Design a protein around this nucleic acid. Structure first.
Lengths: 157, 54, 48, 98, 41, 138, 79, 154
RNA sequence: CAACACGGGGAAACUCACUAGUUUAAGACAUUGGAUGGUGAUGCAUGGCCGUUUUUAGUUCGUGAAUGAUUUGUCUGGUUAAUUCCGAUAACGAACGAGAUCUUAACCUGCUAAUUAGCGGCGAGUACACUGUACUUGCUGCUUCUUAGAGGAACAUUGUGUGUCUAACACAAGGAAGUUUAAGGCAACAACAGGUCUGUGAUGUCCUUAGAUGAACUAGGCUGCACGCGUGCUACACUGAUAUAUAUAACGAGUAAAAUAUGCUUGCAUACUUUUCCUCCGCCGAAAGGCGUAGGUAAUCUUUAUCAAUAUAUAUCGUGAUGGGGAUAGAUUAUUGCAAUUAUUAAUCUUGAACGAGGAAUGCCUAGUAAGCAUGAUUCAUCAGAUUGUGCUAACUACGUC
């Protein structure tokens, strides 16, 4: 009965709800895909309906949440990202950060491009809320991946 | 208008490895750059070929 | 209670339950601020 | 079959694979009919609140429809199509006697 | 202010100028004489 | 036999069909004079006056005009007649004669041969115009 | 007043056991569940209480509760 | 004025071969002279459409409206009332508010269409959805078009 | 500036937080204590997002060199849209930004393709000529044009001038295109106690919680008005108004409530139909509008080889606060809605204010733009003078300077 336009929007909205629902569940593991444990989750969604940036950021907020020192945690994550073969990485931490005045702290390594469509093409980006004692910390992770090719580079054998 | 470091640097590299083939025609040079270079955009390949010709 | 099935108080955002700023074009039923958080995964990409 | 998608490249891959698949078996297809692209455009204010300059961004959801009419037994062409698709391509039945 | 009236180049302005007539009356004179703007006789 | 071609100025398109005939020229179902503004009428007669009356006397011409406004249609028609006459002589009559004819048209104007490609600059938020802005005040 | 029938409470518990899960939906002026023809306000009240006693856990996402039973809850609900 | 020198071959076989206005005025005048279609009396007190916001103020207009409608029917062979209402629409100054086009009055249109239909000029059918032109009218319009073309030309 | 048609904030109700008041429990847990919710307080507790700085051209490192903060690199000069290049040069080498990338729009593939697009082929008539032209029903090679996939095409190409004659510019030619083809999008570093807790179940603390700041219902009100400031709309007429006629546009956008029968008694309850979105079309209505029907979930029906207005042509005025001007008011019948009074909106007749081209001041703008003219979409039960798109009508003036 419904139109194609209506079909496409409903498909997108369903994806968005499911993505947020995955975010509410998935603190017990990394990222290992979706199926289109699994019995209860499948049952809920069926009942209702009828290098990886997210992983690194989720790991980082869990480490931060456990109250480990902020520099040590940031360095540990950053070094792990580089170890995993990153062409560049930047991790930003915003909020209170052990003071009664809010601040941000930047931790960058590697090429870490930002302008234009190569930025969208090669940089995966992730936001995560860490609620700590006096309110909330914002984790923003940016990872620039293994490359197709990066358009600026020109070389000859 | 001019030509950036990426363009000029590439232009210098070509000739460096392929002077003998390169010649005083733009279309032939463009053919050589297309064979030799790894550039992903038409406009950029042309720009390099133009400057190598120059 | 006395609801109406028409007019402003009849409807609210699918995600956040705000009554204001709702996109009803294409029957999305999401407020525009919420829509900005979701706008890539739904498919409503920016270009020009 | 009629192919509807929001991924151009995926539709293109499906188009080539069914085209090769059919042409083995000498099947009658009427060459890829590309329908006018429809874009769902949403014109969105930036900022969740008023302050600062009025700044808008224009979102576009571009949907691709493509069409092939085919004379054969349904089952093989649908089975070839259905296994060869990526789920982002939505497949709909169309069939002729000539 | 008007001071043109009923009784005594074929443009309406020329007739109005020469005989001191309102432009509808100038038009009326033109029509009588002959027997928006367009080609001339 | 028959050749078909076009003209395109702004969003107008005018298709010209140049067939073997007698010198009858129509615009949709309707004769060539029936296009209205007298000033722009002369522009569409203009290629006939540059080429004399003999060349059309062997050929019937049919025209289909769709889209665009008044000025745009007139230029598209003018352009389509140009493109039509020259293309017919390249397939059917003679390349040297066509080159001579093309030279006459080019010598007068290049606008007849190839349409002006000007088209709209998009509206951009912050003002009603394409570039124009809302009035700022302190 | 605001009574919830003994049979209705038992049916909600039974449904929760039978499935393992319940998608209640937050809104209370919607009158039925699609798979229980029960007042949603009543289902919400009992689930709120049940969570409070710690026999059922809710995940929660926008407008939807996603309730899964604790193992002690699964055993408890039978009687 | 009406005649001008021509640099191509005219056909003079149809309404599509002669300018709208001369054909329309003459046909309107002929129609009234013959007295085939009525005024009708109530029609003098009303406007053509709301974009006028005034009396029609031109006396012989009803015959003109019929004449134009008849021509539109040869031009476009299947149409209904809405097409006419849209055709004769023009701009309405809404006082302080901006202009909008506003549709022509549908009773006068409906009446003209009905009178023509009664006289065998135009025809309601299911094969082609609305009003089309029909055979006595088609012949008459074509012939009258020839009669005018010759009479005007030399 | 970077508040002030901004909070998509076009509020009849609800929306709503407010005013006059009235209710309600929807007070989990182990009476009682105990919270949960809060468009409550705090953006100088904060997250996120966004504005400015700035879409300009800036920013940073390794090593080197010159008590220290530091400086050099990153520069007298030439050049450029550009810390763009060249060149000089105690630095050499880098990196991000910028260009580049990407999306449209601009031109060519007689290749790639034909459906719900065209074009012909061909039957058949209606009309006119005259050894074809116009117009409709039925069947059915072509792909130029409609559409959209892939791919091509400009690099300052050639020629001529100017330039350390270096980077490069200037002119002419060629060319679909010569200001990186035109337009966008994307947005470094470091900020601002800029904006937002009235978008959020993002959120700290502080307040509040049955005579609630929760939930909820009825009115009233956000629009009131000696008066001050914004942005728009409509004007001040004759290159015009009025009235007929003719021509012709692009983007689009479209589907647990209604109605009939029965049981009780038009009220209530139950069944059945097929109901809410676009309206063609046929009838009725001055007009609004109505009734009857028909197709459309859409390149298929609304509707598009034509849906706008400025066009233009012919008439009517004839410069006179005038037939300019339509504020203001008075009387209507409609239409939406539970509710229209503070006139929702609609038409119809009547009513006929300021305003004679705008002081001091101050805004926007360089080519399909400016201006003028419309119109689609967004909100929408109903409401564009708003915003955002889109076209048509197509100027002026350079083409530079501090």
């Amino acid at each position: 009965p419904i139109s194609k336009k209506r079909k496409f929007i409903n498909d997108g909205v369903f994806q968005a709800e499911l993505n947020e629902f995955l975010a509410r569940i998935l603190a017990e593991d990394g990222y290992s895909g979706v199926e289109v444990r699994i019995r209860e989750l499948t049952s809920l969604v069926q009942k209702r309906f009828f290098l990886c940036a997210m992983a690194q950021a989720e790991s980082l907020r869990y480490k931060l949440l456990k109250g480990l020192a902020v520099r040590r945690a940031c360095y540990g994550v950053l070094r792990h990202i580089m170890e995993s073969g990153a062409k560049g990485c930047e991790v930003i931490v915003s909020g209170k950060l052990r003071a009664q005045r809010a601040k941000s702290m930047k931790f960058r390594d590697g090429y870490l491009i930002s302008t234009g469509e190569p930025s969208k093409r090669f940089v995966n980006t992730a936001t995560r809320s860490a609620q700590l004692k006096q309110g909330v910390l914002g984790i923003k992770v940016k990872i620039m991946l293994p490359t197709s090719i990066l358009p600026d580079n020109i070389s000859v054998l | 208008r001019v030509r950036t470091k990426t363009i000029k640097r590439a232009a210098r590299q070509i000739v460096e490895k392929y002077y003998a083939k390169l010649t005083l025609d733009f279309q032939i040079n463009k053919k050589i750059t297309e064979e030799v270079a790894i550039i992903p955009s038409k406009r950029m390949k042309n720009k390099v070929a133009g400057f190598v010709t120059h | 209670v006395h609801p109406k099935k028409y007019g402003q108080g009849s409807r609210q955002c699918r995600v956040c339950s705000n009554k204001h700023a709702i996109i009803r074009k294409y029957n999305i039923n999401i407020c525009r601020q919420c829509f900005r958080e979701r706008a890539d995964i739904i498919g409503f990409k920016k270009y020009r | 079959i009629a192919l509807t998608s929001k991924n151009l490249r995926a539709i293109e891959k499906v188009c080539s694979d069914i085209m090769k698949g059919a042409k083995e078996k000498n099947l009658n297809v009427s060459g890829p009919v590309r329908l006018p692209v429809k874009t769902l455009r949403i014109t969105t204010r930036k900022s969740p609140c008023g302050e600062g300059t009025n700044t808008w961004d224009r979102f576009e959801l571009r949907i691709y429809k493509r069409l092939i009419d085919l004379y054969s037994q349904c089952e093989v062409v649908t089975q070839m199509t259905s296994i060869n698709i990526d789920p982002v391509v939505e497949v709909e039945v169309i069939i002729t006697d000539s | 202010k008007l001071n043109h009236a009923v009784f005594i180049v074929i443009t309406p302005s020329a007739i109005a100028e020469k005989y001191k007539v309102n432009l509808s009356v100038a038009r009326a004179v033109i029509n009588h004489l002959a027997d928006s703007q367009k080609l001339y006789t | 036999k028959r050749v078909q071609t076009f003209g395109k100025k702004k969003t107008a398109v005018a298709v010209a069909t140049v067939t073997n005939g007698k010198g009858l020229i129509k615009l949709n179902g309707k004769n060539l004079d029936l296009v209205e503004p007298y000033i722009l009428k002369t522009k569409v007669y203009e290629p006939l006056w540059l080429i004399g009356s003999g060349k059309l006397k062997n050929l019937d011409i049919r025209i289909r005009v769709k889209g665009g406004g008044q000025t745009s249609q007139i230029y598209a028609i003018r352009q389509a007649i140009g493109k039509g006459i020259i293309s017919y002589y390249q397939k059917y009559v003679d390349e040297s004669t066509k080159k001579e004819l093309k030279d006459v048209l080019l010598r007068y104007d290049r606008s007849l041969l190839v349409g002006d490609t000007r088209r709209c600059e998009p509206k951009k938020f912050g003002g009603k115009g394409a570039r124009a802005r809302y009035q700022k005040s302190y | 007043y605001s009574y919830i029938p003994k049979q209705n409470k038992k049916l909600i518990y039974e449904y929760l056991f039978k499935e393992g899960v319940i998608v209640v939906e937050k809104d209370a002026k919607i009158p039925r569940h699609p798979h229980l023809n029960v007042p949603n306000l009543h289902i919400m009240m009992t689930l709120k209480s049940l969570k409070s006693r710690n026999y059922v856990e809710e995940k929660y996402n926008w407008k939807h509760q996603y309730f899964i039973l604790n193992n002690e809850g699964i055993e408890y609900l039978r009687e | 004025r009406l005649l001008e020198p021509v640099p191509f071959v005219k056909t003079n076989n149809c309404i599509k071969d002669v300018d709208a206005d001369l054909f329309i005025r003459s046909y309107a005048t002929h129609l009234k002279l013959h007295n085939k279609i009525t005024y009708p009396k109530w029609c003098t007190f009303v406007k053509t459409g709301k974009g006028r916001k005034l009396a029609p103020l031109n006396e012989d207009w009803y015959f003109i409206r019929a004449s134009s409608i008849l021509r539109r029917l040869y031009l476009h062979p299947d149409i209904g009332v809405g097409f006419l209402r849209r055709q004769f629409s023009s701009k309405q100054r809404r006082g302080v508010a901006p202009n909008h086009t506003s549709l022509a009055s549908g009773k006068i249109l409906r009446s003209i269409l009905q009178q023509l239909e009664n006289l065998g000029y135009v025809e309601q059918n299911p094969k082609k959805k609305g009003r089309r032109l029909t055979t006595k009218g088609e012949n008459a319009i074509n012939n009258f078009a020839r009669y005018i073309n010759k009479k005007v030309y030399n």
